[PDB]
Design a protein around this ligand. Structure first.
Ligand SMILES: *[C@@H]1O[C@H](CO)[C@@H](O[C@@H]2O[C@H](CO)[C@@H](O)[C@H](O)[C@H]2NC(C)=O)[C@H](O)[C@H]1NC(C)=O
Ligand SMILES: *[C@@H]1O[C@H](CO)[C@@H](O)[C@H](O)[C@H]1NC(C)=O
Ligand SMILES: *[C@@H]1O[C@H](CO)[C@@H](O)[C@H](O)[C@H]1NC(C)=O
Ligand SMILES: *[C@@H]1O[C@H](CO)[C@@H](O)[C@H](O)[C@H]1NC(C)=O
Ligand SMILES: *[C@@H]1O[C@H](CO)[C@@H](O)[C@H](O)[C@H]1NC(C)=O
Ligand SMILES: *[C@@H]1O[C@H](CO)[C@@H](O)[C@H](O)[C@H]1NC(C)=O
Ligand SMILES: *[C@@H]1O[C@H](CO)[C@@H](O)[C@H](O)[C@H]1NC(C)=O
Lengths: 299, 228
C-alpha cells in the first residue's frame, strides 16, 4: 500500500555473515614410502618382477616428480593432477628393467614379446606408468649379463602373472629329455649392456602403479591440507568431517580421551576438539533477529 | 566344564563417542540383558562378553576364526610383557593350543599368508571385563579394569566399558577359543552373549555413565523408559 497508519510493523530479518573459512584435520604422519620402490639400485629381471603392496598410510605423489626427467609418464584411468583428490583401497607397485625400444609394449592392448611373454596388462588397467633412462648405472664396458628375459614359451600369459619355470623349450617332434641342442633351446636369454650402445638399446627402469576398488574401507588416501585456527569471529568450519557455522570460543568441558564432539538436550553440536592440537572448543551460532519499523501515520 | 550363574547389572558400554552431561539418553543397540545366564568355566553369534579375575595372567589371547583352521582367515591376538600382535593369518591350530613359556608350536602348527598387521600396548595390565563385537567390516572391542574386593561372584555395581580400538578387517567370525600359558594349574573366567535391546543411560555432569535401565525387564522399567 502507499499509505501507512500509526503502528509498529515487522518488515524483514537479518543475519551476521561469515568472514572466512577454517578446515582442520589430523597430523600427516604415516607417509607411504615411495623412495623405496624408487631407488632400488636392483630392479631384478622383467621375467621375475617384484610386486609390492602399499597400504595403511598416507600417499603423497609429489615426491615422484623429484627424480630425473622421465622418458615416459603416461596415466590412463586417473587424471595426474587429481591423484591426491581420489583414493582407493590398496596400491601395487611393480618394477623391472627392459630395453629402450620395448617401452611401447607396456600398455593395455599391446602385442609383443615383452607384452605377452613376461608382463601382460589387462584392458581396463587403472594407473600410471613410469619409465626413465638408467644407462649410467646399469651398463659396464665388458657387458652386462645379469638382466635376463624370456624368449620362448608354450603359451601366452594371463594378465598380472609371472613365470620362473626354466625348462628346455621343445620345438622338434622328438623329446628333448632335458638336454639342449637340436630343436631344444633354453628359454631365458640375457641382455647385453655397454656404455657405447645407441639410444633404444640402453637400459631403462620401469615402475608401474595400479589402483583398485573392492568391498572394503579405503584405508589409503592422499594428503589432505588444513588451514589455521581463528576464534571469536563468525566463521565457517569443518572439524574432521563435521560442517557448521558459528563462533569458536574456549571451553571448560572435561572430555574423556575418546570423545570428539559434544551435544545438548536438543541434539545439537556445541563442542568440538581440535584434531591437530588436542583442545576443547565451544561453538555458538552467529546472531540473528527480526527487524521492526516504528512510524506514525504517513499523513 | 560348564556352569551357570547370574549376570546382574554388568556389561554396559558407550554406544558412540559423543559427550553428554547430566542428560538421560535412550539407545537401541546390542547389550547384555540384565539378570541373565552367563556360562562359567564356542559359537560367536552376534557378540561376546568376557571376564576373568586371575592374577597369574595365564589367560592371554583370543583366537577368532570362522573355521579355526588354516583354510580360512583367523584373527590372532597375543598379549605379552612388551606389546600386542594382531594378525589375519590362517594358522593351523591344535586341539588344545596353549603357550609353552615361549614356542608357538603347541599353539599352532604352521603359519601362512596374511595381509594385515598391528602392534600396540598389550591389553592386559581385580576383575577385567571385555566385549568383542564385529560389524560392517569393523571389529571393535571394549574393556574395563576394576579393583574388586575379595568376592566369589560378580559385584553389585555399575562399570562402563570404554572403547579401545577399531580394525577395518571385514572377515566373519563364528567361533572363538581360549589360550593359556603353562605344571598343573587352575583358571576361572565367564562368558556372556550380546542381544539387541533398548536401554536408557544416565550421564553425570562429567560425561560418565553412572546408571542404566533395561526397557523390557519388567513393567516398572517399561514405565520408567516411557516417562524418561
Ligand atoms: C594370501 O594370499 C592369497 C593368494 O595367494 C590370498 O587369496 C586371495 O584372497 C583375496 C581376498 O579374499 C581374493 O579376492 C583372491 O581371489 C584370493 N586369491 C587367491 C589366489 O586365493 C589371501 O587372501 C591372502 N591372505 C590370506 C590370509 O590368506
Ligand atoms: C636416492 O637417490 C639419492 C640420489 O643420489 C641417493 O643419494 C640416495 O642414497 C638414494 N636412496 C636410496 C638408494 O635408498
Ligand atoms: C601435529 O603437529 C603439531 C606441530 O608439530 C603438533 O604441535 C601437534 O601436537 C601434532 N598433533 C598431535 C596429535 O600430536
Ligand atoms: C540359567 O541356567 C541355565 C542355562 O542354560 C538355564 O536352563 C536356566 O533356566 C537359567 N536360569 C536359572 C535361574 O538357572
Ligand atoms: C612379545 O611379543 C613380541 C611379538 O613379536 C616380541 O617382539 C617381544 O619380544 C615379546 N616380548 C618379550 C618380552 O619377549
Ligand atoms: C562370512 O560367511 C557368511 C556365510 O557363511 C557370508 O555371508 C559373509 O559375507 C562372510 N563374511 C566375510 C567373508 O567377511
Ligand atoms: C568432575 O570433574 C571435576 C574436576 O576434576 C571434579 O571437581 C568433579 O568432582 C567431577 N565430578 C564428578 C566426579 O562427578
Amino acid at each position: 500500500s502507499f499509505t501507512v497508519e500509526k503502528g509498529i510493523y515487522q518488515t524483514s530479518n537479518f543475519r551476521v555473515q561469515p568472514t572466512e573459512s577454517i578446515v582442520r584435520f589430523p597430523n600427516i604422519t604415516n607417509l607411504c614410502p615411495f623412495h623405496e620402490v624408487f631407488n632400488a639400485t636392483t630392479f631384478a629381471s622383467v621375467y621375475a618382477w617384484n610386486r609390492k603392496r602399499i597400504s595403511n598410510c598416507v600417499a603423497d605423489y609429489s615426491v615422484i616428480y623429484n627424480f630425473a626427467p622421465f622418458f615416459a609418464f603416461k596415466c590412463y584411468g586417473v587424471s595426474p593432477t587429481k591423484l591426491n583428490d581420489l583414493c582407493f583401497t590398496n596400491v601395487y607397485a611393480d618394477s623391472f628393467v627392459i630395453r629402450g625400444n620395448e617401452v611401447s609394449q607396456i600398455a593395455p592392448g599391446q602385442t609383443g614379446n615383452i607384452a605377452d611373454y613376461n608382463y601382460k596388462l589387462p584392458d581396463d588397467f587403472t594407473g600410471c606408468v613410469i619409465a626413465w633412462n638408467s644407462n649410467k648405472l646399469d651398463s659396464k664396458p665388458s657387458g652386462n649379463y645379469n638382466y635376463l628375459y624370456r624368449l620362448f614359451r608354450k603359451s601366452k600369459l594371463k594378465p598380472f602373472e609371472r613365470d620362473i619355470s626354466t625348462e628346455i623349450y621343445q620345438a622338434g617332434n622328438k623329446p628333448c629329455n632335458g638336454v639342449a641342442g637340436s630343436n631344444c633351446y633354453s628359454p631365458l636369454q640375457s641382455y647385453g649392456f655397454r656404455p657405447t650402445y645407441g639410444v633404444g638399446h640402453q637400459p631403462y627402469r620401469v615402475v608401474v602403479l595400479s589402483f583398485e576398488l573392492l568391498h572394503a574401507p579405503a584405508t589409503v588416501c592422499g594428503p589432505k591440507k588444513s588451514t589455521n585456527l581463528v576464534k571469536n569471529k563468525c566463521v565457517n568450519f569443518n572439524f574432521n568431517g563435521l560442517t557448521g557455522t558459528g563462533v569458536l570460543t574456549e571451553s571448560n568441558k572435561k572430555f574423556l580421551p575418546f570423545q570428539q564432539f559434544g551435544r545438548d538436550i536438543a541434539d545439537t553440536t556445541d563442542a568440538v576438539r581440535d584434531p591437530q592440537t588436542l583442545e576443547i572448543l565451544d561453538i555458538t551460532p552467529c546472531s540473528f533477529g527480526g527487524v521492526s519499523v516504528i512510524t506514525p501515520g504517513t499523513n | 566344564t560348564q556352569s551357570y550363574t547370574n549376570s546382574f547389572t554388568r556389561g554396559v558400554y558407550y554406544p558412540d563417542k559423543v559427550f553428554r552431561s547430566s542428560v538421560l539418553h535412550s539407545t537401541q543397540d546390542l547389550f547384555l540383558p540384565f539378570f541373565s545366564n552367563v556360562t562359567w568355566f564356542l559359537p560367536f553369534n552376534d557378540g561376546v562378553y568376557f571376564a576373568s579375575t586371575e592374577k597369574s595372567n595365564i589367560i592371554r589371547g583370543w583366537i577368532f576364526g570362522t573355521t579355526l583352521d588354516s583354510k580360512t582367515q583367523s584373527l590372532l591376538i597375543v598379549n605379552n610383557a612388551t606389546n600386542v600382535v594382531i594378525k589375519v593369518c590362517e594358522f593351523q591350530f591344535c586341539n588344545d593350543p596353549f603357550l609353552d613359556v615361549e614356542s608357538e608350536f603347541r599353539v599352532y602348527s604352521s603359519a601362512n599368508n596374511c595381509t594385515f598387521e598391528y602392534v600396540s600396548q598389550p591389553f592386559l595390565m581385580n576383575l577385567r571385563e571385555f566385549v568383542f563385537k564385529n560389524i560392517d567390516g569393523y571389529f571393535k572391542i571394549y574393556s574395563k579394569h576394576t579393583p574388586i574386593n575379595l568376592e566369589r561372584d560378580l559385584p553389585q555395581g555399575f562399570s562402563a566399558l570404554e572403547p579401545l580400538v577399531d580394525l577395518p578387517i571385514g572377515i566373519n567370525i563364528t567361533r572363538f577359543q581360549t589360550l593359556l600359558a603353562l605344571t598343573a594349574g587352575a583358571a576361572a573366567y565367564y562368558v556372556g552373549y550380546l542381544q539387541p535391546r533398548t536401554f536408557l543411560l544416565k550421564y553425570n555432569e562429567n560425561g560418565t555413565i553412572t546408571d542404566a535401565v533395561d526397557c523390557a525387564l519388567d513393567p516398572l522399567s517399561e514405565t520408567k523408559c516411557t516417562l524418561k
